[PDB]
Design a protein around this motif. Structure first.
Motif, short mmCIF file in Angstrom:
data_model
loop_
_atom_site.label_atom_id
_atom_site.label_comp_id
_atom_site.label_asym_id
_atom_site.label_seq_id
_atom_site.Cartn_x
_atom_site.Cartn_y
_atom_site.Cartn_z
N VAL C 234 0.80 -1.21 0.00
CA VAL C 234 0.00 0.00 0.00
C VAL C 234 0.85 1.28 0.00
O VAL C 234 2.01 1.28 0.42
CB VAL C 234 -0.92 -0.01 1.25
CG1 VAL C 234 -1.56 1.34 1.47
CG2 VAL C 234 -2.00 -1.06 1.11
N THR C 235 0.22 2.37 -0.45
CA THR C 235 0.86 3.67 -0.52
C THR C 235 0.67 4.44 0.78
O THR C 235 -0.40 4.44 1.37
CB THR C 235 0.27 4.51 -1.66
OG1 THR C 235 0.27 3.74 -2.87
CG2 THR C 235 1.09 5.76 -1.87
N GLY C 236 1.73 5.12 1.20
CA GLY C 236 1.68 5.91 2.41
C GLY C 236 1.72 5.14 3.72
O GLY C 236 1.42 5.68 4.78
N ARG C 237 2.12 3.88 3.65
CA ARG C 237 2.19 3.06 4.84
C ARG C 237 3.61 2.96 5.40
O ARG C 237 3.82 2.31 6.41
CB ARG C 237 1.63 1.67 4.57
CG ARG C 237 0.75 1.15 5.67
CD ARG C 237 1.16 -0.25 6.06
NE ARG C 237 1.19 -1.16 4.92
CZ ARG C 237 0.19 -1.96 4.56
NH1 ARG C 237 -0.94 -1.99 5.26
NH2 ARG C 237 0.33 -2.76 3.52
N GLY C 253 1.26 12.67 8.10
CA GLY C 253 1.00 12.91 6.70
C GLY C 253 1.90 12.15 5.74
O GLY C 253 3.13 12.14 5.91
N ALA C 254 1.29 11.52 4.74
CA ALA C 254 2.02 10.74 3.73
C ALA C 254 2.42 11.62 2.56
O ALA C 254 1.71 12.57 2.23
CB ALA C 254 1.16 9.58 3.24
N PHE C 255 3.53 11.28 1.91
CA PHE C 255 4.02 12.07 0.77
C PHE C 255 3.58 11.56 -0.59
O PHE C 255 2.85 12.24 -1.31
CB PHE C 255 5.54 12.11 0.78
CG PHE C 255 6.12 12.76 2.00
CD1 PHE C 255 5.48 13.83 2.61
CD2 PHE C 255 7.32 12.31 2.53
CE1 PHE C 255 6.02 14.43 3.76
CE2 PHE C 255 7.87 12.89 3.68
CZ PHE C 255 7.23 13.96 4.29
N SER C 256 4.06 10.37 -0.93
CA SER C 256 3.77 9.72 -2.20
C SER C 256 2.33 9.76 -2.69
O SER C 256 1.41 9.37 -1.97
CB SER C 256 4.26 8.27 -2.18
OG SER C 256 5.67 8.20 -2.05
N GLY C 257 2.16 10.19 -3.93
CA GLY C 257 0.83 10.26 -4.51
C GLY C 257 0.16 11.62 -4.46
O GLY C 257 -0.87 11.85 -5.10
N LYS C 258 0.76 12.52 -3.69
CA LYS C 258 0.23 13.87 -3.52
C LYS C 258 1.11 14.88 -4.23
O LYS C 258 2.34 14.82 -4.13
CB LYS C 258 0.15 14.20 -2.03
CG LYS C 258 -0.69 13.20 -1.23
CD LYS C 258 -0.60 13.46 0.26
CE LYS C 258 -1.38 12.42 1.05
NZ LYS C 258 -1.18 12.57 2.52
N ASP C 259 0.49 15.81 -4.94
CA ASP C 259 1.24 16.84 -5.66
C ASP C 259 1.79 17.92 -4.73
O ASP C 259 1.56 17.89 -3.52
CB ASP C 259 0.42 17.47 -6.80
CG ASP C 259 -0.86 18.14 -6.31
OD1 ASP C 259 -0.93 18.56 -5.14
OD2 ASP C 259 -1.81 18.25 -7.11
#
Ligand SMILES: Nc1ncnc2c1ncn2[C@@H]1O[C@H](COP(=O)(O)OP(=O)(O)O)[C@@H](O)[C@H]1O
Ligand SMILES: Nc1ncnc2c1ncn2[C@@H]1O[C@H](COP(=O)(O)OP(=O)(O)O)[C@@H](O)[C@H]1O
Ligand SMILES: CO/C=C\[C@H](N)C(=O)O
Ligand SMILES: CO/C=C\[C@H](N)C(=O)O
Ligand SMILES: [K+]
Ligand SMILES: [K+]
Ligand SMILES: [K+]
Ligand SMILES: [K+]
Ligand SMILES: [Mg+2]
Ligand SMILES: [Mg+2]
Ligand SMILES: [Mg+2]
Ligand SMILES: [Mg+2]
Ligand SMILES: [Mg+2]
Ligand SMILES: [Mg+2]
Lengths: 368, 368, 368, 368
Positions: C234-237, C253-259
Motif C-alpha cells: 500500500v501507498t503511504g504506509r 501525513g504521507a508524501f507519495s501520490g500527492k502533488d
C-alpha cells in the motif's frame, strides 16, 4: 403435429446483459473514431464494481470511465438502492490498448442461420414475445407510465405449437413468466396487475392470449435491491437469448465485445440475413442455413440450406439461389452489411436477430 | 445427402473451463459432507487471480482456499511461467454461506436431449473426437510422454457427412485444428509432429483419416506463457462444448456451479438419458427428445420425441415407451441418477455427455 | 549520556514502496506535460495485481498501463518467480481524470523538520546507514556484481550513542539486520558472506564497525519467491522510513501520490530545508523546526525552532534568522524548491530526506 | 516558553479506520476460540468493496463474511447512500488460514512510550480532545440526539502551550477543525451550530475555550455521500492518530491486524504503561521511555527514560525504578497485560493510548 416450446430473455439490467452492453459500448466508442479499430474486450460486474478487460488495437482517444458509466446510466442505474449507481460504482479498467474484400476467414468455423414465417420478424414467436415483453417494460420505465419498474428483468414465454406439412405454426401462449426489479413503494398485487394489462396484453396478439393462459408474474415475490449482482455478471454468457431462443442451432460463439473481423459475429449475421431473405422471397417457410469456413480461406467452405420440407424449389436449387445472390466472404459481409458502423450496443440487448433496424435484418432481393 | 459439420472443445487449462471445474469442485466439496447442500456458485479468473462468487446454503466445513488451489493444481498449474501457480495465485473468496419425490420443478423450463448411433457413445463424431483429442493430450501430459504439453488447449474437428434414409452417417475427417499451450524448450516442428502421430492418429479411427485430411496444428505458431488468461475466464460460458457440439438444441442453461435441484442440470441429464436409451434400444438411430417443465409442477409439462424418420415405431408410440419406462419428475431424476453424488468436477470438462462413467450415460432397459 | 537507537528501511521491491513509487511515477508523468496537474492518487498491489486508484485533475495524455508497468520493470520485476512481472501482472486502473505566491495553505497543519550534524547528510546515522545499505544492494543488483539479489529487501541499523553538552554523537554500530529477496541458485552461506563484505563493510564507516558488532543477515533463512505480496502492499504506509527513522517528529501525513499543492509534502520539505540550513550554517548541531499552518492563511501560523541546547544564538534569535532568510508560504515554497519538477519517483524510495540531489537538501545561505 | 501544537483524529467511518477495525475484529474473532491464534491480516476497502488479506495460523472456526459485515454494521453503515451497506458490500476474502515467559523478541526493534500530566489520561491535550471530539459525535449518532450524523469524520485540535521549568502546560484551544459525514436533510448552518454547542462545548473544558478560539466546522461545505471511499481505505495507515498525535516518537510500526506476539504492538503498549506509571507515581511530569529489543533475545536490549527535566530522581535512578518494577520481556508483557484477550477492535479507533479500560493504561504501583 403438436409440441410445445419455451424461450427466455432478460432486461438491460441483467448482470450478464450489462456486460454485453458495456463491452459493445466500448466497441462503438472506437468505431466512431477508427472504423478499423480491432476490438476484443469483455466486462465483469458485481454490485457497484465493473471490470473492463480486453485487448484492443485502435487509434482513437476513449474515456473508458465515461463509456462505462454512461452505459450504466442509460440502463437506468442512477440511484443507490437499485443495486448500481453510475456515479458511485467502481470501474476498474484493466484494458490494454495499442495503436497501429478477399481477406480470409479467421479460425475454422461453422455459423448457423435461422428463419421462420410464424411472425413478420421471421423469428420464433416464443423468443419474439419474450424480447418484446422486456422491451415494453423498458418503455414504461423510461416513459414514466410504470415508475416503479427497475432495469433488471427476466422473461419466459412458452407457446403451444402444431406442425403443418412443412413446419411450425404457433397456436396459443400456454404460460408466461415475468420477473422484474422494482421500487419499495409498490404492492405485489399492483405489479402483477400492471404486468398483465399494461405489458403482456399490450404486446401479445389477441389470437394467442387465452382464458387458460398461465401467468406467473413476480413468482418469487419481491425483487427490490436485486440490482446487478446475480453472483457476478459476465459477457457472452447469454448466448441463446441473443439468437433464436433455442430454435436454430448454435456453435457456441459469443457476439458482444468482438469486432466485425471475427467470423463469430459477422458470418452469424450473414447467415441470418440469407435465412430471412429466403423465407421472405417465398422460397420456404422455415430454414436453417449452415455456413462453414476454413481458416485462411475467404470463400465459405460449404454452405448448407436446411428447409424442413417447406420449400418447393428443393435444396440444391436453393443453394444456387444463395450462390447467385450472396457473396458470404468475410470482407464482403462487413461491406454489404455496413459492419464498421457503431450499432453494436443496441444489438447487445433484446436479441441480435429480429429487429429490422439492423442491416442483416433487411431481406435481400433474391433474383432466383 | 452430403453436408459437413464442425465442433470444438477445450482443455482443462482453458480459462472458462478452469472456472467450470473450480465451481463444480466447490459443489463436490459440499456434497461430500451434506448431500442436500444448496450450491449456486461461479468463478472468474484472470492471470493468477481467481474470484469465487456465490450463494450456498449448506452445513459442511469447507476450506475454499484448499478446494480452489487443489483444482488449479490438478489442472497442471504448479509453475510460474505456465500462467498460473496454485501456490501463488490470488484466491479472492466473496462466497456467502448460510447453514439451514414429487417436489416440483423450479422455473419454467425446456430441456433438450440428443443421441445418434454414429458412435458407440451415442454422440456426434465431431464433438466426440474433439473431446477425445483434448483428453489424450492431458494423458500424455500427465504420463510424461509429452512433457512439453501444458494445460490450456483448444480443439476443432470438422467431419464430412451423408444422410441415410433416416440420418447422419460420418464419412471422413475433413480437417482438424488443434492448439495447445507449451514449454519453451520444444520446436514448432516437433510439436506438430507429435500432435499428428501421438494424439490425432492415436484417437481418430483409421476409417476417417485420409490422405487429404487437413491438419492445422499450432496454427498461430507459439502458445507458451499463454495459459489461463485470454483476458478473463468465466463459468457457464462454454455451454455448447459441454453438450452436443452444436448438434442438438440448447435453451441456454449452464451446468457448472449449480446443484442437482436446478432443472437446468438434472433435467438436461435426464433428457440425454432417455435419448441414449432410445437409440440403444434400437427404437431409432437419431433422436432429439424435448422435455418441458412448468414452474411449481413436478410431472413434466409435455415431452416431445424427435426422430428424423429413423424410427419404425412412430412418434407417439415412442412417447408411450418413454412414459412407461421413465419418470422424469425432478426428485425422481436425482434419485434414479444418483445426483447427490460428488461427480460434478469430472463433468466440468471434456463434455457432460458421452462418457459412460456418468449415471445418465447408462442406457435404461426400456421394456417397450 | 548513553542510549541506543534503531532505524529501518526497505528496498524498491517492498510492496509498500512499490506503491509509493508507482503513485509518484504517475505524478511525474503528469508534471512533465502539465506542471499544474492536480495529482491525488494511491496504489495497492498483491501478487501480480496492481490497483491504481485516485482523483487527478490534469490536462496531459498518459498511458497508465505504461507508467505502472515501466515502474515495475525499473524496480527489477521482469521474471515470473520474482513475485512480479511487468509484462504479465494485472494492472487494474480505477483512476478518475478530469481536464480543467500568496495562495493560502490547505488544511490546518503542523509540519516538522529535523537535522543533526552526526553525518554530512545532516540525518541520523541509523537511518542513513539503513538507507545506504539498501541502496548498495540495488547497485550490486543492477551492476551484475551480485546477480542473485532480488528487488525486495528490509534493513535495520541500531547504533549506540552518547550525548554531548548539546546532543547526539554516534559511537558504534551495535547490530545490523538485513533481509533481501534472492534467486534459488545461491547458498545461504554465500549470501551472508556477500552481505557482510560487499554491502555492509562497503557502506559503513570503519569507525563504527566493531569486533562485537552483531550481524543478522537473512535471519529467517530463505526469501526466494517472496515477491510483492507481503499480504498487500500500500501507498503511504511507510511514513517513518520516508522521513527520519523515528528521530524527529511526525504528524502522520504521507508524501507519495500527492502533488506539490498539499502542505503535507511541500511544507515538510521546506521544514527539512531550514533545519538542514541551520546546522550547516553552524547555528546549531541538532534542530527540530516546527512549522504550523492555518487553513486559508498563506503565511505560516507560528514556527518553532527546537535546538537541544546545541545553539549559541538562542531560540528567538534563530527564529528571526529563519524569518529573515525564509518565506515558508506554500506558493513560495514550490517556487523556491522547484516543486513542479518530476523528481517525485526517486523520492519514493530510500528516503525523502538526506540525498543532496533534492532541492530541499541544498542548504540556503543564511545571512544571519 | 510558548509554542503551539496540532493533532488529529478520525471517526470509525474513516476508510483507513474501517480497515483497522475489521482487521482487529478478525483478530478478536480468533482469540475468543484460540488465545494462541497467530494473526497477521490487513484490510483494504473502496466503495462497497472490502478485501481481507492475511496469513493466520489458528484453530478456530470463523465466518469472515460475518465478522467483516458485522464490523461495518457496528460502524453505522447500513444504508446505501452512506457509502457502505454491510448487507450489500463486496467482501472479497483472500485470507490464508492454517491450523497448527522467556520467549525471545522477534525482529530487532525500538519501541517508544510517552506520558505527560497535562490531562488525567496522561496524554497530550491536543490528541485527547481530538479523539473525544470524534467519540462524542458517535455517541450523539448512536443515541439519536444528532440523527443526521454519519460514521466518517475528521478532527483537528490546535492548542497554544507554554513550558514550565520542566515541561508542557496547555493554555487554550487556538482553533478546532471538524468535518463529519451527514444526511441530506440537514442545513450547513444547523450542523455547524450543533458541532459547536453539542459536541465541542460538551467535551472541551471551559478553561480552554475562548472568545477568540477559531472554529472550522464543515469547512469544505457538504460531506454527504462521502463515506468510506477517499479513494482507497487501508490498514496501518493511521499510525500517528493511533498513538500520541505526533508528540512522542514513532518507529513506524503499525498495530491493527497483528497479534500479541509482535513486539510492534505489545512492547509499544508496555512502554506506554511504564510511562504512564512513572508520571502517575509523581516521578516526573513528562516522560519519553525508549525500549529497545534484540532479535532472539527476550530481555530488552537497553531501555532509556527521557524526562525533560521534570523529574527530581534523575535518569539512572528512574531506570532502576523501572528495572525493579517492570519485566518488559515479550512473554511477560502479554501475561501481565492480558494481551490474549479480544479487546483489539475497540483499540482500533479513537486511539490506542489514553483510555483507562485498557490494561496498559492502568498505572502500576511502583515501589521506588
Ligand atoms: N471471437 C474471437 N475470434 C478471434 N479473436 C478474438 C475473438 N474475441 C477476442 N479475440 C482476440 O483475442 C485477444 C484477447 O484475448 P487473449 O487470449 O488474452 O490474447 P493473448 O493470448 O495474446 O494474451 C484480443 O487481442 C482479440 O483480437
Ligand atoms: N494530502 C492531501 N491533502 C489534500 N487533498 C488531498 C491529499 N491527498 C489527496 N487529496 C485530494 O482528495 C481527492 C481524492 O480522494 P477522495 O476523498 O475519494 O475525493 P471525494 O471525497 O470527492 O470522493 C483528490 O481529488 C485530491 O485532490
Ligand atoms: C497463439 O494462440 C493463443 C491462445 C488460445 N487460442 C487461447 O487463449 O485460448
Ligand atoms: C468535503 O470533505 C470530504 C471528505 C473527508 N475529509 C474524507 O473523505 O476523509
Ligand atoms: K464474449
Ligand atoms: K452460455
Ligand atoms: K498517501
Ligand atoms: K504508517
Ligand atoms: Mg487461427
Ligand atoms: Mg486461453
Ligand atoms: Mg470456444
Ligand atoms: Mg479544508
Ligand atoms: Mg473519508
Ligand atoms: Mg489523517
Amino acid at each position: 403435429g403438436a409440441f410445445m416450446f419455451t424461450s427466455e430473455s432478460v432486461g438491460e439490467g441483467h448482470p450478464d446483459k450489462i456486460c454485453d452492453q458495456i463491452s459493445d459500448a466500448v466497441l462503438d466508442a472506437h468505431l466512431k473514431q477508427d472504423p478499423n479499430a480491432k476490438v476484443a474486450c469483455e466486462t465483469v460486474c458485481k454490485t457497484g464494481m465493473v471490470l473492463l478487460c480486453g485487448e484492443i488495437t485502435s487509434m482513437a482517444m476513449i474515456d473508458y470511465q465515461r463509456v462505462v458509466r454512461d452505459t450504466i446510466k442509460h440502463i437506468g442505474y442512477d440511484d443507490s438502492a437499485k443495486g448500481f449507481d453510475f456515479k458511485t460504482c467502481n470501474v476498474l479498467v484493466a484494458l490494454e490498448q495499442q495503436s497501429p474484400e478477399d481477406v480470409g476467414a479467421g479460425d475454422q468455423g461453422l455459423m448457423f442461420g435461422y428463419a421462420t414465417d410464424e411472425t413478420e420478424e421471421c423469428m420464433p414467436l416464443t423468443i419474439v414475445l419474450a424480447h418484446k415483453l422486456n422491451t415494453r417494460m423498458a418503455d414504461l420505465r423510461r416513459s414514466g407510465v410504470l415508475p416503479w419498474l427497475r432495469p433488471d428483468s427476466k422473461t419466459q414465454v412458452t407457446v403451444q405449437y402444431v406442425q403443418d406439412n412443412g413446419a411450425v405454426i404457433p397456436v396459443r401462449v400456454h404460460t408466461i413468466v415475468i420477473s422484474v426489479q422494482h421500487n419499495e413503494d409498490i404492492t405485489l398485487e399492483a405489479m402483477r396487475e400492471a404486468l398483465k394489462e399494461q405489458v403482456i396484453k399490450a404486446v401479445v396478439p389477441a389470437k394467442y392470449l387465452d382464458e387458460d393462459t398461465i401467468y406467473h408474474l413476480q413468482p418469487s415475490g419481491r425483487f427490490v435491491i436485486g440490482g446487478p449482482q446475480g453472483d457476478a455478471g459476465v459477457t457472452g454468457r447469454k448466448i441463446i437469448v441473443d439468437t433464436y431462443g433455442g430454435w436454430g442451432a448454435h456453435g457456441g460463439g459469443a457476439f458482444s465485445g468482438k469486432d466485425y473481423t471475427k467470423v463469430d459475429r459477422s458470418a452469424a449475421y450473414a447467415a441470418r440475413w440469407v435465412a430471412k431473405s429466403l423465407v421472405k422471397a417465398g422460397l420456404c417457410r422455415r430454414v436453417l442455413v449452415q455456413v462453414s469456413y476454413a481458416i485462411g480461406v475467404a470463400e465459405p467452405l460449404s454452405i448448407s440450406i436446411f428447409t424442413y420440407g417447406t420449400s418447393k424449389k428443393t435444396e440444391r436449387e436453393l443453394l444456387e439461389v444463395v450462390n447467385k445472390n450472396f457473396d458470404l466472404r468475410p470482407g464482403v459481409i462487413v461491406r454489404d452489411l455496413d459492419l464498421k458502423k457503431p450499432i453494436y450496443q443496441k444489438t447487445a440487448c433484446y436479441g441480435h436477430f429480429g429487429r429490422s433496424e439492423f442491416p442483416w435484418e433487411v431481406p435481400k432481393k433474391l433474383v432466383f
